[PDB]
Symmetry: D2
Subunit: 494 residues, 4 copies
């Protein structure tokens, strides 16, 4: 069941959120957000900058003072508030899914059944951690009692991208709030609207003022101001590898804030000759084309063993040609537009690059519609490792298929990347599966599946794909500051 969408949802929230209230930018500036299916302006949104970030950081710091409501609140009650926020997002699920589709472009059926479902599951998962992330009592040498407190890291700056706007918001707020931190969040200028509506729900859930503050605006202004802020304790950034470097340098040049990064990839999807062909073709299609190709972990190097290459490619081209591109509010649509004009042009540039460098264009390759930013599902065959389209993240509906012979060969080729976000293996053989999952240098390895995210299992990069992990128990580590307390006692005994 998917409820019929409101195809022109009303916008209620379009300002800066600080201390549970809505503010214009100090400059009074606004910027337009565009509906990528039509190329039309949806509305204007407050354009936050350094001075607005400063206000937000001050508010968050005040909310974090010893003795404040948020610091004194029982950990279990932090869990109750996360569960209440999830209930309110569920109340407003049909609205939020439609607004997500309007601002981002992804199909409404997918916003509804996938993104919003995952948001609810992420928040509810982290609600349960709030009162369970224990410190330790430690049997130190000597006449002492030693223990650790797991305290919050403090004021957390969180910068999120446009590809999964609500889900990325949840992946950040869940662990940070479960562990009693306070947040200054910068949302993507391409997709600010759904995160701002969720701020209304944060207020309605009962979170104290200043615990979550959201500043819409641009990267070099608002994002940079968070990264360089002298009173932000920790930054978590999801976005390009290039900007990740900018964030880590900003941290080191300012106050030595702690940093985690979730960046791009060029993830390999390895199809052994003993794979289930029908399932491997469908899953390789999903692995690449999911979310208009705008997935950090997209399976954008599809390695296929030579004895099954021709058949796999024939089936993959047929499936790409059948993929329905169109109005994301139409239930038949499998692929909406790309998020914006900038991305649209970049993907057209990468398609031309693949043609220029001699990849075999097997289908697509062009613009799919007049209005908006729609690109045909595009498949390149006989891709070679030295090709730019085999090295660089394209972030669009452009599939690369490579041929290989041996399992030893494919490990080396899959690992010969400065990225390392994810990888997958399709095989029926126990030993091939264990060989490859061990050898692949990637933060997640899927076996006979792809893009299986669970709030319970961590996700993040090796190499230039990131540092730190999100989701799972691991997602709490970056949000905790550990204090050892070591007390002299009269006589220690076991």
């Amino acid at each position: 069941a998917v409820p019929a969408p409101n195809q022109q949802p009303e916008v209620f929230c379009n300002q800066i959120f600080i201390n549970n209230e809505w503010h214009d930018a100090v400059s009074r500036k606004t910027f337009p957000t565009v509906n990528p299916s039509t190329g039309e302006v949806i509305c204007q949104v407050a354009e936050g900058d350094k001075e607005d970030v400063d206000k937000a950081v001050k508010a968050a710091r005040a909310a974090f003072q010893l003795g404040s409501p948020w610091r004194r609140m029982d950990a279990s009650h932090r869990g109750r508030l996360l569960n209440r926020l999830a209930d309110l997002i569920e109340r407003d699920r049909t609205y939020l899914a439609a607004l997500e589709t309007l601002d981002n472009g992804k199909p409404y059926v997918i916003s509804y059944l996938v993104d919003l479902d995952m948001v609810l599951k992420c928040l509810r998962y982290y609600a349960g951690w709030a009162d369970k992330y224990h410190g330790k009592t430690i049997p130190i040498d000597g006449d002492f009692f030693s223990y650790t407190r797991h305290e919050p890291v403090g004021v957390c700056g969180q910068i999120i991208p446009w590809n999964f706007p609500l889900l990325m918001q949840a992946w950040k707020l869940g662990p940070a709030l479960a562990t009693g931190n306070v947040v200054v969040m910068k949302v993507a200028e391409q997709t600010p609207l759904t995160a701002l509506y969720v701020a209304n729900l944060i207020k309605e859930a009962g979170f104290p003022p200043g615990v979550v503050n959201i500043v819409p605006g641009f990267g070099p202004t608002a994002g940079a101001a968070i990264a360089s802020h002298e009173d932000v304790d920790k930054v978590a950034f999801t976005g390009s590898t290039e900007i990740g470097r900018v964030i880590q340098v900003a941290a080191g040049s300012s106050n030595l804030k702690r940093v985690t990064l979730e960046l791009g990839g060029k993830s390999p999807n390895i199809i052994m000759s003993d794979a289930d062909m029908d399932w491997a073709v469908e899953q390789a299609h999903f692995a690449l084309f999911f979310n208009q190709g705008q997935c950090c972990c997209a399976g954008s190097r599809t390695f296929v063993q030579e004895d099954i290459y021709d058949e796999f490619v024939e089936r993959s081209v047929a499936r790409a040609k059948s993929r329905v591109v169109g109005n994301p509010f139409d239930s038949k649509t499998e692929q909406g537009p790309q998020v914006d004009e900038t991305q649209f042009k970049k993907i057209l540039g990468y398609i031309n690059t693949g043609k220029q460098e001699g990849a075999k264009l097997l289908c697509g390759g062009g613009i799919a519609a007049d209005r908006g930013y729609f690109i045909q599902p595009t498949v390149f065959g006989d891709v070679q490792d030295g090709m730019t389209i085999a090295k660089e993240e394209i972030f669009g509906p452009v599939m690369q298929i490579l041929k290989f012979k041996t399992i030893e060969e494919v490990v080396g080729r899959a690992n010969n990347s400065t990225y390392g976000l994810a990888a997958a293996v399709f095989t029926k053989d126990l030993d091939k599966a264990n060989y490859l999952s061990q050898a692949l240098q990637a933060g997640t390895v899927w076996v006979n599946c792809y893009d299986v995210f669970g709030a319970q299992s961590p996700f993040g990069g090796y190499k230039m794909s990131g540092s730190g992990r999100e989701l799972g128990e691991y997602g709490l580590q970056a949000y905790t500051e550990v204090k050892t307390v070591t007390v002299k006692v009269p006589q220690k005994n076991s």
Copy 2:
């Protein structure tokens, strides 16, 4: 390489060990221990009874008093003492290997390369845990600081069997001493000698008196005295399922001491049609015949898929016929005698029942020598689930081969047992391996291997094969008593 044995090692320790000193039994009684290869008496051993156990418990209780050297010792220093014990065992490795073979019957090459290596690894593993099994600091509601102390459970009665005398001693002492407990250990009357020599090494290593006390004697006397003792806090028993019942009843009927049990099995070893045949045949042979068949977790129901049954049986019979039975000090010997007359007779009884009930005797079936408790490697084919030899633990060199058709069928048959210690699956297929390891109701499931013990991984029974786990971090749980301390504080903050 294996250093040459002394085939007639001198015995230095044959008394009751209490407070790091050697005692005759109060009664002055002694019992003989016999070399099963010859049937001849090795020496007399002090025959401990209730009054000797009471002496040992009082010594243990004194060593456990708050403020004692053992209670005040740094946890890291307990680790140092376990490491020193291991080094002394390593120094005396050839002696202990030869003594183990003399008293138990197992081949000297195996005592040396397997049993003594596993002992060293177990003690060294647990030495590492001594100062790492942390309690918790807990974010309880209200204005409180709450934490747990992991304290020792106290005076631990440990009753160990004769099949792996040194290794079982180490599996019990490692976790108990790492966590700061004190021990009263009852060793098997068939194989008391190696454990008593290790007590001498415990003294040499510098453990405080009373921390380990060892009482040789019989079960209905010394074992029962431990199980019913009013000042023993915890009992751990490895032995038959039948005597396990006696232990749990004695705990309930005395002081509600905590109980863990490692009991018998009738473990299924499932060979799918896609298994590597050479490896599956060799591993199924090992699985059944290891240690003269005297292993809790022996793979004593070998289920073989019907398409490979005839070949598997032919190869298995050839391998059993080649198995060399002989003097356990001869380097060529694969199989020594059974441990004693009682076992010898029980096994010959089971072989008779297998013949009577219409299982197909394919090789062996009788005594293997005119002196010593030696039994021919015996294989029965066409075994059916209702046969005595398919249901009861035989604990000797008697293999059962059963035919099956489907994966669903074999799960039901494998699980239709009141035992659940171990199981194994041989297959190349990822999904079959995952299906079966999930579905089998056993404490350990091996995939494409058997009898792979590691000090790092827990072991123990489902159903009537026992309760609790030994080895790994889990092996510490039963040796810990948890104390919560909850302290009023002026104002709790995150």
Copy 3:
């Protein structure tokens, strides 16, 4: 802040609950449950016996079959169901609190603000554990991949007492359900009604049939049938130390089911001369008198340092003389009746013994009303260690005050008990608090507080006060069966 009670709440559920349906007993027998405030029968309740337990166990076993809805359910969804159950209990809170008071006797204000609050908090806490109790991946020696699965123990028999009927139900259901077990629960004949209403809510919440079955009935019949059942995998019993023995013997005598026990106490509450006097007096009052004295962990030996003894006693008597005993539906009432006539007589017997043995009766000592089971708050002074009232659990409103001189003396006297459920220390001094919390042989030590329970912190006995722990992460341990899977791999690498 308390809604007015319905003082004559209607009873909707009074039968056996199996497969989400209501059943008469096979015998068609019923038993009365009485309102202890009046001595009058509230209603009849189905009298479950062995045959009813057998129906319940079969239903639970079917629900636990591999591939069943409950076995296949996502762990996170078990959490959702526990949260839904909590929401339903919250919807029905005013009703449940009144029904609890009617059947048990405790003041409605306390049923509402304490028992129901704790129930909600326990279930919501364990909802969060459902998808977080991870097994391990383990770096075993050799070319292997080794891991553990945390599986459910299976069919869990749960026997709960009458003192906190709803809370004890929650303490048992929360961890068992979080970990995917199925339950056969026997509730106390004195207080069956609220647990049966909760069963209706379990159905309403969506739990699959057979996952929770409740058999009301007597101990020697229904409870013994559970303890001895050949297809119950685990039993958890809360009640007297005497019946705890019977349970452990039944487990040993039947199928070696796993056992945990929460039993009685005679917990010491130690007041040092440097304690805050007013806080100590009020907390010592609470420690003993809470819940009509019907608390496992009641502070029933109040040790008071000699320098403050007279003042402490004078203040303690003033408070006992002014504690209001009355209709539990009246908001002024601090103390309701005892649960039944048996307990009423037993407590009066203990008061008689206290006087005969030479303790100083300082107030109370007799019946408090002409109908219902009301006893005057009673304080004995100059109590000595060897007196019956200093040794045996009274379980009523009878306070023992003992004088001591030194901290070393009081440790020894406090620990000279076969009980060890809880203890407390009142002092301003850091070293005295740490000295005593370490030295006291009790499962919970409170410092400057008493009866502080939190779902996050474990609770249970040393010595003959029980084995195992409830609440916290520890509360999951007894509901988990650990399986090791060890898989041959081509080549293990770090």
Copy 4:
């Protein structure tokens, strides 16, 4: 007992250590290391630069290749190698203690009994972790088996300071080697010799070539080359806050390597009026003066409650005047020289600054010898928060005493610092201890003690004092890269 030192120990190792071999610098340059007790050159040491770092990184990367001896080694065997290294250090303890004193200046008795004891304890502690840092099996939604592998982060650059040369080496090597990483270590130019001798012992112990590589040289050359290297996966730096910034920027500007930092402090030691005076005076002296004042966590703001100020100061000055400064090989010597002329001058600079800004010079204040870098124990009274000597890390034998009135005052003044490495509280009151340990913003809070390091408890800074933790289980986190493996299965069951 302390063995007689060789007061002029010979030097055997003074080159670059790569692949278990000794190399001159590619440039053939050497630099002098000086004995700070005399100002004289001990020997020349190879002057490693970028080319030498590149050689060491390539060696480490090769040793880390899948299938290498170090990658394939059992985790338990990594533990055995750490234990062997510890045994070799213990063999050579008298030598290494004297060499440490020669090159660093600290008293031989302290090198022997404190530094070397702690080195052995750190290595032995981490040996025990090698096979115990488990990944997880995770109950993800859907028909999947999901688990994590804890893999090594890879090639680890480790840059260590001169204050505790051997102990800082052990703090770095223990966790890195326990978890399977490989190391390129840069040692301080002031104190390279003991670390290079330990490299000989690493070879002797049997670590594969390339697993530990050590490059002596300068910071702007060798250190920077490590921080900026494109194939170093992780850097750990201990040193000044200033250079920490440099390291973090290099990581961001190069390859996004993971960073941890242990930086300086200005740690507050708070003496409440109810402290034990004699203990507080002795411990405040140790807190400041230990190791010639050259300790990251030195108690360099001694806050003393006004009611005990005059007495505490009188006793502190008497203790400082009694402190014996001299030849660190003489058994009576409590304080040796400062490490080098640069530090000697900088500390004298701060003393002058203190006198000029109006702190009261109570004793000391100048040079203590005319040869070698010896400074008188110096105590300033009536210090105020805004003074340079109250704000900047002096890293010498210069004590600051500040007066305060209230507990809220002292918390706020202690926390008004951009440092937060450590703090201490001296009080007999339970509530004051708990109030302060919670409220102080520091990575370690000691109560009634100071400088209590245990390999079991983590250490690290808040704020500008660092990020990440060393020691304990926490010290392994920065050395682990987490991989999630998520496998499709036929039917997931609990």
